Write an enzyme that holds these catalytic residues in place. Structure first.
Site, PDB file in Angstrom:
ATOM      1  N   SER A 106       0.853  -1.192   0.000  1.00  0.00           N
ATOM      2  CA  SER A 106       0.000   0.000   0.000  1.00  0.00           C
ATOM      3  C   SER A 106       0.890   1.244   0.000  1.00  0.00           C
ATOM      4  O   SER A 106       1.772   1.351  -0.868  1.00  0.00           O
ATOM      5  CB  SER A 106      -0.965  -0.124   1.166  1.00  0.00           C
ATOM      6  OG  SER A 106      -1.911   0.927   1.150  1.00  0.00           O
ATOM      7  N   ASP A 188      -9.526  -4.170  -5.702  1.00  0.00           N
ATOM      8  CA  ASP A 188      -9.014  -3.467  -4.534  1.00  0.00           C
ATOM      9  C   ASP A 188     -10.065  -2.486  -4.013  1.00  0.00           C
ATOM     10  O   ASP A 188     -10.535  -1.615  -4.755  1.00  0.00           O
ATOM     11  CB  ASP A 188      -7.729  -2.738  -4.934  1.00  0.00           C
ATOM     12  CG  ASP A 188      -6.931  -2.238  -3.748  1.00  0.00           C
ATOM     13  OD1 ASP A 188      -7.532  -1.706  -2.794  1.00  0.00           O
ATOM     14  OD2 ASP A 188      -5.688  -2.349  -3.795  1.00  0.00           O
ATOM     15  N   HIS A 225      -7.489  -5.378  -0.872  1.00  0.00           N
ATOM     16  CA  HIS A 225      -6.259  -4.626  -0.644  1.00  0.00           C
ATOM     17  C   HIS A 225      -5.259  -5.437   0.173  1.00  0.00           C
ATOM     18  O   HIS A 225      -4.066  -5.470  -0.146  1.00  0.00           O
ATOM     19  CB  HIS A 225      -6.597  -3.310   0.059  1.00  0.00           C
ATOM     20  CG  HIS A 225      -5.508  -2.288   0.001  1.00  0.00           C
ATOM     21  ND1 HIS A 225      -4.972  -1.837  -1.185  1.00  0.00           N
ATOM     22  CD2 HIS A 225      -4.867  -1.615   0.985  1.00  0.00           C
ATOM     23  CE1 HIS A 225      -4.041  -0.933  -0.929  1.00  0.00           C
ATOM     24  NE2 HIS A 225      -3.961  -0.777   0.379  1.00  0.00           N
TER      25      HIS A 225
END
Ligand SMILES: [Cl-]
Ligand SMILES: [Cl-]
Ligand SMILES: [Cl-]
Ligand SMILES: [Cl-]
Ligand SMILES: [Cl-]
Ligand SMILES: [Cl-]
EC number: 3.1.1.3
Length: 318
Positions: A106, A188, A225
């Site tokens: 991320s 995501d 994610h």
């Protein structure tokens, strides 16, 4: 051309940057085959990676090392990057003056690419970058004005259109700087847009090895994610990238038979449960952290690349 010349000065005292760096069973200053793990928003290094790439990188022969920039990666992304730059300088020397791989989740990938763009000294010390769900363009789902008119500094910077993502792009940062593999998912729920399997995607870097999971596994394959980091499919791609002689994952090393969206097979039962539970700490940390009504000012080294944007102190000027 990229920024060149001297590294920018640290805004943080170096002793503070040192305090944020840890290796498992070794000192960062005397470590064999380190890998530097850069966590996601709202988490520490252990919170991002205890359930996945800390044990998985260990079993591949690396010493897992990580940074945990305070508080929980919620501060200024430019400050989080100082933790990574100091860590690369330390781990490079501490490993015998050898390049090391960097593995991210991320925001950690945004931090890594920001560091490579604006701190030229680390370009020759990073062997390769393996980024899981990196948001180099930020996300249109960030909502810094969602449910509260103040949001964490790094939440502002990870919003699509931000001064930070603008400056990264305008300085040349959406092209890979070291050999880079980007593993991401069209489904995501944190970072979008990711659906086009093209440079439009937030995780895409030009000349990188850009692996959208649905491009390999099918349009209806679903990883979120966190699963972009923890899944067995992600492990096979990441293992490929770490072993490759080109510095990037090789299409030959993974295929439809690796399309398992559940936590990596080699994790312990307790790690798999923790891997599936990943996101919750880094959804809650926001709550108790720093929040403001504006995007942090760009450091002077990045201001010329976002002329016309607006941050806390006013209009970005060179
Ligand atoms: Cl200092
Ligand atoms: Cl330890
Ligand atoms: Cl920590
Ligand atoms: Cl975010
Ligand atoms: Cl396998
Ligand atoms: Cl602003």
């Amino acid at each position: 051309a990229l920024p060149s010349g001297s590294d920018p000065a640290f805004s943080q005292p170096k002793s503070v940057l040192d305090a944020g760096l840890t290796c498992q069973g070794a000192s960062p200053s005397s470590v064999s085959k380190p890998i530097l793990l850069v966590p996601g928003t709202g988490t520490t290094g252990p919170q991002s990676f205890d359930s996945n790439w800390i044990p998985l990188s260990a079993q591949l022969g690396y010493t897992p090392c990580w940074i945990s920039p305070p508080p929980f990666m919620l501060n200024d992304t430019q400050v989080n990057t100082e933790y990574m730059v100091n860590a690369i300088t330390t781990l490079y020397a501490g490993s015998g003056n050898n390049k090391l791989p960097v593995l991210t989740w991320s925001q950690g990938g945004l931090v890594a690419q920001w560091g490579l763009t604006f701190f030229p000294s680390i370009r020759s010390k990073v062997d390769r970058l393996m980024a899981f769900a990196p948001d180099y363009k930020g996300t249109v789902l960030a909502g810094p004005l969602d449910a509260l008119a103040v949001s964490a500094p790094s939440v502002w910077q990870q919003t699509t259109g931000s001064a930070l993502t603008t400056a990264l792009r305008n300085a040349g940062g959406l092209t890979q700087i070291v050999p880079t593999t980007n593993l991401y998912s069209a489904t995501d729920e944190i970072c979008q847009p990711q659906v086009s399997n093209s440079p439009l995607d937030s995780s895409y870097l030009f000349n990188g090895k850009n692996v959208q999971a649905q491009a390999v596994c099918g349009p209806l394959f679903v990883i979120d994610h966190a699963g972009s980091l923890t899944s067995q499919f992600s492990y096979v791609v990441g293992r490929s990238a770490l072993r490759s002689t080109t510095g990037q994952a090789r299409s030959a090393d993974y295929g439809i038979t690796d399309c398992n969206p559940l936590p990596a097979n080699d994790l312990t039962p307790e790690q798999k449960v923790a891997a599936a539970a990943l996101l919750a700490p880094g959804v809650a940390a926001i709550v108790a952290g720093p929040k403001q009504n504006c995007e942090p000012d760009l450091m002077p080294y990045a201001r010329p690349f976002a002329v016309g944007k607006r941050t806390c102190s006013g209009i970005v000027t060179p």
